[PDB]
Design a protein around this ligand. Structure first.
Ligand SMILES: CC(=O)N[C@H]1[C@H]([C@H](O)[C@H](O)CO)O[C@@](OC[C@H]2O[C@@H](O)[C@H](O)[C@@H](O)[C@H]2O)(C(=O)O)C[C@@H]1O
Ligand SMILES: CC(=O)N[C@H]1[C@H]([C@H](O)[C@H](O)CO)O[C@@](OC[C@H]2O[C@@H](O)[C@H](O)[C@@H](O)[C@H]2O)(C(=O)O)C[C@@H]1O
Ligand SMILES: CC(=O)N[C@H]1[C@H]([C@H](O)[C@H](O)CO)O[C@@](OC[C@H]2O[C@@H](O)[C@H](O)[C@@H](O)[C@H]2O)(C(=O)O)C[C@@H]1O
Ligand SMILES: *[C@@H]1O[C@H](CO)[C@@H](O)[C@H](O)[C@H]1NC(C)=O
Ligand SMILES: *[C@@H]1O[C@H](CO)[C@@H](O)[C@H](O)[C@H]1NC(C)=O
Ligand SMILES: *[C@@H]1O[C@H](CO)[C@@H](O)[C@H](O)[C@H]1NC(C)=O
Ligand SMILES: *[C@@H]1O[C@H](CO)[C@@H](O)[C@H](O)[C@H]1NC(C)=O
Ligand SMILES: *[C@@H]1O[C@H](CO)[C@@H](O)[C@H](O)[C@H]1NC(C)=O
Ligand SMILES: *[C@@H]1O[C@H](CO)[C@@H](O)[C@H](O)[C@H]1NC(C)=O
Ligand SMILES: *[C@@H]1O[C@H](CO)[C@@H](O)[C@H](O)[C@H]1NC(C)=O
Ligand SMILES: *[C@@H]1O[C@H](CO)[C@@H](O)[C@H](O)[C@H]1NC(C)=O
Ligand SMILES: *[C@@H]1O[C@H](CO)[C@@H](O)[C@H](O)[C@H]1NC(C)=O
Lengths: 169, 314, 169, 314, 169, 314
């Protein structure tokens, strides 16, 4: 990964997050929780989708036979033809392999990128009212109830109205 | 509060710039391997030549009688096809084939040659119709009687059309130098031909060939394209197969060679001998000689494109 | 964006920053301000400029006619020629489209990258004497005067000589 | 303190790996569409053949009289050009054209054939100079009197130069078998030719052709390249057009076909029929048959390269 | 650099770190130190190595002569051949140059990336017990002895057992 | 605690997407410039034709006597090689060369022609064995006595094998029309040839050529491939060089042209005239006409790939 997360200071993924790609998991008083961020999961999906539609591509360039499979053309012109054809095959096999590798690298990195964007944005919601665990978890110094959790997730958590309390702690 | 990403128990391995066989959450194929073993011709005027060879549509052996003036978007040649009834072949044959494959079909026009002082109804057991016959669009010009001389004739044809005329004539090579005389008289037989574009000439070559169709004689077939308002002259003294009708191209088509069936229930633009490549994928590992509108041929059997993040299970 | 800024935790750009690409905008006592960072704006400009000079490129490879437009060459050799030519066109049309897309993606990401470098460097100038707003703005807890602003911009702001005061606050 | 980036009211849309039509601050074109409709020839020795056909510079029809020994970096062929005064054509013509296009021009050398017991001054109304004339670099060899025989002659020419010599000869095809005899006598006329590299031979083909320039006779033109110190033999008995001078190539040039004017006020290396592609851009959508030093031809009309960041207005 | 480090808020490299690519240098009481992180240095090495093995590549595609160097083939077919050959050369010279440039850009950025991963992970080991100098150095507010250094390097430094002491300071 | 990366006093400059000549810690070459000036043939059945020309292995000039039935994975042609003892050449020569280069060698088979009423032992001082000899695989068919007539003969050969038979015959072009008669009698001499695939015919062309090997006569060499169970007929009346044995291809090989030595101590698959390109690198700037399995040819002399980070010294 190019952005350090997703294998990662985050040590692994959750085979239970069947609801999305990226998500929040919280431990507090009222039990246990795990949700999905849509806006992150969507931006990544829409970016990957963009690649797909770009590569699943139709030529409008028609090609005809210059060869004959029932009655072989003259050897010399035949050999030039095959030589040419093979040359073009080399070029396309090369292009194809590179394209896919290049794309897979970038696909992976932007997936890593999106995680880091999510994290580094939650971190900014919770100024001094929390500190970094380092495994992608946030230690809360004012015991957020489940409503205080959804305040973070839905991106409305208050930036000062838990502050000096959580600052004391 | 803790955050993370999804994962699965079984990932798909892909290749990257740096790493080989890294597992991602989801992947999708990029090379088409799936062939449909039919000529998907839905929506297209198709002509399946069957036993009629492409070049035969211009000259007219019996197997081409229902193809003398065909019209098509898609032309299919079949291994069983033959261009010929009386043994012979076309000089510069494949060029002509390529022309006919994208002609969109042909249209025939009488050239209006009339004959004075020769025969005109040559036939053979190789060309079976009524009984013995000949090429429908051609005329086997003899000498009036079972020996005789051939009068140095001069026919001409002007292309009165806005499109180039496909002219085809034939040269006859008899089994013997005796046979050549029995058909056209003794002597050196000469055929000369010219346009505003063309300069050539022909002499026969009597001699024994292997028996094909039962015969050791051959026929040379020659052809040229007469531009609009240009004129063609035929100077000759025997051993000559004369064009009756000239051919004109209809428009535009694609020609393939195939051994599979036509299917008007599936649509496709990428064709090869074994059928039709229907695909959205940019590449294919099925047939490098595929024609029409095709994904690029590549050597690789498979190239997986990542559609998800790295798969990391616990 | 690959680096999370520029649309972005920064929610938009400034149609008034006609002086550069990246810049500082400050609200304090003495009124209002908006300037441009040169070193950031320049590094990006010089990187984009590098791409330009690399792609605006001259072949020294001469090609001659193998075809005739006044008097058509023989059909067979003609068809091989066109077939070849069309094949090469496919390859170049492909190369061109990919090259430009690849480059545009990277151009954009490095533009995003440069912003993040700027931010994350100012943030380091202002250790505990300030905290992150989260929209690319920095809350100052010691009311920097305009001279204290230019101290940050010109990269000379003091890392401790506003500290315990701003720490109190 | 707050920071941000610039933006504009109107951005330029580009395409990326993932997104189609994203707006950036600034963009710049990458495909050249702008043609200059002239042959930009500033600084180059240019020869505009006009009515003289390239191949004619070697044989010498009247329209080529001022081009028998030209010198050029850039050779322009014109649709109005003709290789011929007396109707005929070149066997293997386009190969020869390609050779002459990059010859850097030609230099002529007398081959020094002398004749004993024939005529030498054949002419025609198709080749107008004084009155009736012929190809300047060629000689129309007859039989001494209005009928006669032709003596089986043997001329030879040795290439005494360090460069290959372009040898051209002609074969005459008369309207009749009568005419052939009136020029060279009766009989089968044979022309044989050999080098240390070359093996061929030729027989005429008298017969009526269409009237071109007023004439139904044709002339076959044939050619070969004599390597240094190699020797060429001409064995013949009539119907022969003899080379007077041999040609030598000067160096190096480029040849184009165009219908536009020359302009010595603009410079360019990328040429096509409609003019000159002056550009720094790596690609062009103007003419795929462009020659010289050109950006690559591509199918796309436009491909915008981002020169700025994403444009985000409020 | 795409990740802002390595020339960089880190102003230069160490011509003495002959032990690895990335490393720790510490100033404390007991003298002076400089070591190498293996896990960072290795991940980068293994990524670069991956590129190498991918590009050092063998075709199994045989090509034969269609040309003759002792006895020149006919001019026309010769010119088509050369024209084709030259065209393919243009394509490969292009592919080669682009491939290498593209790869060098990415090689460099991932090298920059790995540094940032290292830093931003040490930073997370030292929560409030330290603060950022801004040149890639960490100011320690509890005077780590050499054993406390190796606690960081070997990734075992305690996240709270120097805390309130270093917090006082 | 402070962290950093390594650096060196001297870096290697590379090129990136954005920057030209940036210094990295380490770099490695990507274009091969190093040639090994030998034909690395370790492990391969090699045939170095030396003075024997490839085409000569089929007909049999004295210099090819030890190559009439060779077997190879790798065939080397040498500039000194010659296809011919009696002056002449092959029609469609390079096609045949390409065939023989990948034949894996040849295998000879008597065609079993017998002669009745002619001569059969033609020879020359150009083909030196005992004294005067001829092509080993061919037969120079004369007329029984120093003048005579030639009986219009008809030989045939059926390919009884599962592989195509390489048939070669010759046409003799004498110095004079006198000489032609002294060998085969007066008259127009005709050679006709046919298969289930082939249609052609030949007439000689007597006349003086330049003296090569001491001789002004030439021999035309012609060839065709007889498919399994297909049959070839030879109708002729003189000036004929008859095949004695037919040739069959052994399997598969590669053919090169080189001026360097063979070396069985080094292995390689990429060959050119100057030797062998042994390399793992994806590209090479040595020879664009290199054959076998080669890195791609590129124009650039060097393209450095970064194997380390940016080099930043203090
Ligand atoms: C117009 C004409 O002459 N038709 C003949 C034809 C020609 O003479 C011949 O094809 C030219 O070479 O010959 C055909 O009969 C030939 C037939 O004769 C048998 O005796 C023999 O056993 C067969 O092998 C075969 O050669 C023909 O039918 O084509 C007759 C035809 O009327
Ligand atoms: C050297 C020579 O014989 N020049 C003749 C030339 C040749 O005979 C002819 O070109 C060979 O085929 O013939 C020319 O006059 C021919 C002229 O005759 C008129 O009667 C007729 O009406 C015209 O159509 C035309 O054929 C010629 O000028 O080229 C005469 C020339 O002197
Ligand atoms: C089968 C046969 O006829 N062999 C002859 C051969 C042929 O006649 C000739 O190659 C066909 O064109 O001629 C050879 O001798 C010719 C020899 O004669 C000298 O007088 C002359 O000075 C030489 O230049 C040369 O032409 C030959 O050896 O090939 C003789 C051979 O027996
Ligand atoms: C050309 O390639 C085809 C397969 O694509 C092969 O079967 C054929 O033999 C080749 N042509 C020649 C001249 O052998
Ligand atoms: C896997 O990839 C394909 C890509 O076309 C997609 O259709 C499918 O939704 C994906 N499967 C899952 C589980 O997302
Ligand atoms: C052919 O002749 C007709 C009648 O003179 C004329 O209308 C037409 O333009 C001519 N075509 C050409 C191109 O010569
Ligand atoms: C080759 O391409 C040109 C246009 O580039 C086209 O006009 C021409 O018809 C083609 N050649 C043949 C054989 O038709
Ligand atoms: C837009 O792009 C072009 C690229 O060549 C450049 O010349 C021009 O300066 C740019 N315009 C602005 C407003 O920067
Ligand atoms: C041609 O002959 C001259 C004089 O003998 C000589 O100087 C020159 O080397 C010869 N050229 C060749 C290559 O045969
Ligand atoms: C083809 O290219 C070679 C070099 O690769 C050159 O020497 C040769 O002259 C070219 N062919 C022709 C027809 O000149
Ligand atoms: C430099 O690069 C090459 C790449 O093959 C490698 O073998 C070598 O180890 C490198 N040198 C150093 C000092 O790492
Ligand atoms: C050739 O003939 C033999 C014997 O009749 C037979 O076994 C073989 O199949 C034939 N080959 C072909 C393909 O005609």
């Amino acid at each position: 990964g190019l952005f350090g997360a997703i294998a990662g200071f985050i040590e692994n993924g959750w085979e239970g997050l069947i609801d999305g790609w990226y998500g929040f998991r919280h431990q507090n008083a009222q039990g246990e929780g795990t949700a999905a961020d849509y806006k992150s999961t969507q931006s990544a999906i829409d970016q990957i989708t963009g690649k797909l539609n770009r590569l699943i591509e139709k030529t409008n360039q028609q090609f005809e036979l210059i060869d004959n499979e029932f009655n072989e053309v003259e050897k010399q012109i035949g050999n030039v033809i095959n030589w040419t054809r093979d040359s073009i095959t080399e070029v396309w096999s090369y292009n194809a392999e590179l394209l896919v590798a290049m794309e897979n690298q970038h696909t992976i990195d932007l997936a890593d990128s999106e995680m880091d964007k999510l994290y580094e944005r939650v971190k900014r919601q919770l100024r001094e009212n929390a500190e970094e665990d380092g495994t992608g978890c946030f230690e809360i110094f004012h015991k957020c109830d489940d409503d205080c959790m959804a305040s973070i997730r839905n991106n409305t958590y208050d930036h000062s109205k838990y502050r000096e309390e959580a600052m004391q702690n | 509060i803790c955050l993370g990403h999804h994962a699965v128990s079984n990932g798909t391995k892909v290749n990257t710039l740096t790493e080989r066989g890294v597992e991602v959450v989801n992947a999708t194929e990029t090379v088409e391997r799936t062939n449909i073993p039919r000529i998907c011709s839905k929506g297209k005027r198709t002509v399946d030549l069957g036993q009629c060879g492409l070049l035969g549509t211009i000259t007219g052996p019996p197997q081409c009688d229902q193809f003398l003036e065909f019209s098509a978007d898609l032309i299919i040649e079949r291994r069983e096809g033959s261009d010929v009834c009386y043994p012979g072949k076309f000089v510069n044959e494949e060029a002509l084939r390529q022309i006919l494959r994208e002609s969109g079909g042909i249209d025939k026009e009488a050239m209006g040659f009339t004959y004075s002082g020769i025969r005109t109804n040559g036939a053979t057991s190789a060309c079976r119709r009524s009984g013995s016959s000949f090429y429908a669009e051609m005329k086997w010009l003899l000498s009036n009687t079972d020996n005789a001389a051939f009068p140095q004739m001069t026919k001409s044809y002007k292309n009165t059309r806005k499109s180039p005329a496909l002219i085809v004539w034939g040269i006859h090579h008899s089994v013997s130098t005796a046979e050549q005389t029995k058909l056209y008289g003794s002597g050196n037989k000469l055929v000369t031909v010219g346009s505003s574009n063309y300069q050539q000439s022909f002499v026969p070559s009597p001699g024994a060939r292997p028996q094909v169709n039962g015969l050791s004689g051959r026929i040379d077939f020659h052809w040229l394209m007469l531009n609009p308002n240009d004129t063609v002259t035929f100077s000759f003294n025997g051993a000559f197969i004369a064009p009756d009708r000239a051919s004109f191209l209809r428009g535009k088509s694609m020609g393939i060679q195939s051994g599979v069936q036509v299917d008007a229930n599936c649509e496709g633009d990428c064709y090869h001998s074994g059928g039709t490549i229907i695909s959205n994928l940019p590449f294919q590992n099925i047939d490098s000689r595929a024609v029409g509108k095709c994904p690029r041929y590549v050597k690789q059997r498979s190239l997986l494109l990542a559609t998800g993040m790295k798969n990391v299970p616990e």
